[PDB]
Amino acid sequence: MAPRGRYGPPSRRSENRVVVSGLPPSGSWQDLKDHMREAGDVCYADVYRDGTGVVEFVRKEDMTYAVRKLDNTKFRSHEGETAYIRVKVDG
């Protein structure tokens, strides 16, 4: 998606970010959108390969919704396993 082969804003940018912690080592930015889609129209995510990452939606209200209904609930990844996530406000 609109690559540049160099450092910079990855692909979808944001406005209303929230952390996603407790994530399995299987997680990635690609799978975070494929699941927070429940909370709303997530458009960007980022991952730190260490059990933490971030995600954002087209509307800031869908974000606080993702850390009140999609916090402390199941999440899934391409590796074939699942774990809870502890969404946070941002950091």
- The footprint of RNA (CB under 7 A) covers 1-8, 10-12, 28-31, 33-34, 44-50, 52, 77-79
Shortest Å, Cβ 83 to RNA: 14
Shortest Å, Cβ 23 to RNA: 12
Could you give the angle at the alpha carbon of 27 between the alpha carbons of 1 and 12, nearest 5°?
A: 30
Q: How far apart are CA 49 and CA 4, in angstroms?
A: 22
Q: Which is nearer to RNA, 55 or 67 (CB)?
A: 55
Asked if 40 and 66 touch (Cβ cutoff 8 Å), the reply is yes
Shortest Å, Cβ 84 to RNA: 18
DSSP 47: E
